């Protein structure tokens, strides 16, 4: 690893600098280096890792969607043949996207998840596992598409089961997990009713627990609750 010679603390410092500079590829590389030191990640560090890769893959997904749309339009009736270039370049972006997902999944498997015993860490990593399998699913079209979808589902389900047992219904990781699993149901699993039920039940159980929270915890939980409401509004 190119980061093998850099101190763990220096990698974390530089990840924070990269975030300030909106250098998310660098941020991700620094955090991958930090993970590969072999120590568990603190809460702050877990969130640096997630922010970095979310921004990298988010850019790739956006680009993929642009290219896939152009490609789909090229394959309509009346469309003039433009050669293999659109497919080639969509494939290039797709392959890069898959590479990033595989990298993140690799970090989780070697060895973040197995060392994560606290609910906060284990749920966080399992949510990530579901998310990155979901991104793989978005672009999957072959023999393995069903298995990729099932891998996402399984990771999210394990995270949900732990979160329900071990976390209050307003915990932001629990809320974000539910938000994303609901989107998985709607967009990937062709289960819009499940998506809607999950979002509604999550919102309502959070609402009922807000009274227990400080002002600052209230802010965090209500932000994610609003995202649940936004999706429900989109879907109904």
């Amino acid at each position: 690893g190119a980061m093998g010679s850099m101190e763990r603390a220096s990698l974390i410092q530089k990840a924070k600098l990269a975030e300030q500079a909106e250098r998310y590829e660098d941020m991700a590389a620094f955090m991958k280096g930090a993970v590969e030191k072999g120590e568990e990640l603190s809460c702050e560090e877990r969130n640096l890792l997630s922010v970095a890769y979310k921004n990298v893959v988010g850019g790739q997904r956006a680009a993929w969607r642009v290219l896939s749309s152009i490609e789909q339009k090229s394959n309509e009736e009346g469309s003039e043949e433009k050669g293999p270039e659109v497919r080639e370049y969509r494939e290039k972006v797709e392959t890069e996207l898959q590479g990033v997902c595989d990298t993140v999944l690799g970090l989780l498997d070697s060895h973040l998840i197995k060392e994560a015993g606290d609910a906060e860490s284990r749920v966080f990593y399992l949510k990530m596992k579901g998310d990155y399998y979901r991104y793989l699913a978005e672009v999957a079209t072959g023999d393995d598409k069903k298995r990729i979808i099932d891998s996402a589902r399984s990771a999210y389900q394990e995270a949900m089961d732990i979160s329900k047992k071990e976390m209050p219904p307003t915990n932001p990781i629990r809320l974000g997990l539910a938000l994303n699993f609901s989107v998985f149901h709607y967009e990937i699993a062709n289960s819009p009713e499940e998506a809607i039920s999950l979002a509604k039940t999550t919102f309502d159980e959070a609402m009922a627990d807000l009274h227990t929270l400080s002002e600052d915890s209230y802010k965090d939980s209500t932000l994610i609750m609003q995202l649940l409401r936004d999706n429900l509004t989109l879907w109904t």
Binding site: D131, N180, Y186, I224, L227, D230, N231, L234
Partner: peptide, 5 residues
């Protein structure tokens, strides 16, 4: 697209 975090 729907919201995720």
């Amino acid at each position: 697209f729907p919201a995720t975090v």
